[PDB]
Design a protein around this ligand. Structure first.
Ligand SMILES: Cc1n[nH]c(C)c1[C@H]1C=C[C@@H](O)C1
Length: 339
């Protein structure tokens, strides 16, 4: 429909203007008070902070430059910030400020207090098909937007979907996102969600995001992922076999959609055929979905997370609290000139 085509044409114009002239150096560390560590990882962490003049809360991602270099993540870190400052969509967490100092890189994002989808799924066991479908529809629209900008996301998993104050999804962590016009080759992502062409070290494309959507829909509706096993090597053997067993409680329409997303041959996989995303939006499993109402946030959500206010951390867990130290000498200045 021409309305969708004109929406995506404007979205790409606005993205390219910011892509070609990125914002830089829009806050500094002593403009914020540190409150609590919300998550940790290999080269960085995310902290709840409060802005000292406005009182607004944010989620500040802190990356150690020396560790980014040692773990060979320089290009990935530069991709994450340049993409986040250029995108704009209802189901993506927004970047509000970025800056660097002698030791670290900082991305100051909006704080989403309802928790990871992963925590809520594991609490309740599994989601009903209507509940899974509401979240899946938001990921379909988000991938339609990103892929039209020539972006591949490459980190879909339940931990990266946050539930907001209206019960809608916001996608976080763009550390593996990349602008790709043809093929790309890096090994990255979490094992249970990798497409066969990544495990086999091929040149791959946006079809890996549609495979990961099949894994996510299966895990939401069953309570566990389709290729589960105790060690990565055994997970990878199941994935490239592609043999999938479905619970008897799944509907016939759900099984049919998942066989077409979890297709081992990327040239036959839904999302990657001549009709693109419309083979997914027009599938019988989505017949009750009002795509415009979801985009406009007019559908009542399946549940609203319990929290007391914009500063409540109850839906996140507890981590050892470490210093944010800044060296008196500059580190790795050349590598991060463009940040
Ligand atoms: C919550 C939140 N709001 N915005 C961001 C970037 C977050 C991260 C903090 C811990 C991770 O689970 C997600």
């Amino acid at each position: 429909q021409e309305s969708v085509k004109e929406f995506l044409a404007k979205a790409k114009e606005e993205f390219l203007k910011k892509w070609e002239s990125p914002s830089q150096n829009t806050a500094q560390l002593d403009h914020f008070d540190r409150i609590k560590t919300l998550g940790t990882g290999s080269f960085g962490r995310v902290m709840l902070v409060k802005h000292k003049e406005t009182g607004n809360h944010y989620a500040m991602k802190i990356l150690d430059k020396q560790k980014v270099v040692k773990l060979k993540q320089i290009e990935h870190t530069l991709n994450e910030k340049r993409i986040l400052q250029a995108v704009n969509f209802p189901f993506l967490v927004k970047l509000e400020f970025s800056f660097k100092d002698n030791s670290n890189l900082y991305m100051v994002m909006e704080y989403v207090p309802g928790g990871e989808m992963f925590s809520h799924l594991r609490r309740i066991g599994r989601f009903s098909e209507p509940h899974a479908r509401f979240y899946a529809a938001q990921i379909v629209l988000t991938f339609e937007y990103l892929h039209s900008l020539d972006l591949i996301y490459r980190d879909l998993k339940p931990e990266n979907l946050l539930i907001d104050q209206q019960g809608y999804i916001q996608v976080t962590d763009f550390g593996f996102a990349k602008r790709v016009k043809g093929r790309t080759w890096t090994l990255c992502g979490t094992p249970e969600y990798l497409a066969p062409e990544i495990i086999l070290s091929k040149g791959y494309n946006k079809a890996v995001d549609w495979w990961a959507l099949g894994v996510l829909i299966y895990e939401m509706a069953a309570g566990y992922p389709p290729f589960f096993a105790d060690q990565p090597i055994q997970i990878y053997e199941k994935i490239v076999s592609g043999k999938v067993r479905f619970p008897s409680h799944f509907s016939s329409d759900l099984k049919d959609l998942l066989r077409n997303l979890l297709q081992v041959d990327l040239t036959k996989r839904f999302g990657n055929l001549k009709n693109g995303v419309n083979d997914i939006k027009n599938h019988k499993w989505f017949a009750t979905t009002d795509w415009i109402a979801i985009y406009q946030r007019k559908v009542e959500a399946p549940f609203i997370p319990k929290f007391k206010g914009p500063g409540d951390t109850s839906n996140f867990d507890d981590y050892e609290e470490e210093e944010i130290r800044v060296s008196i000498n500059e580190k790795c200045g050349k590598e991060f000139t463009e940040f």
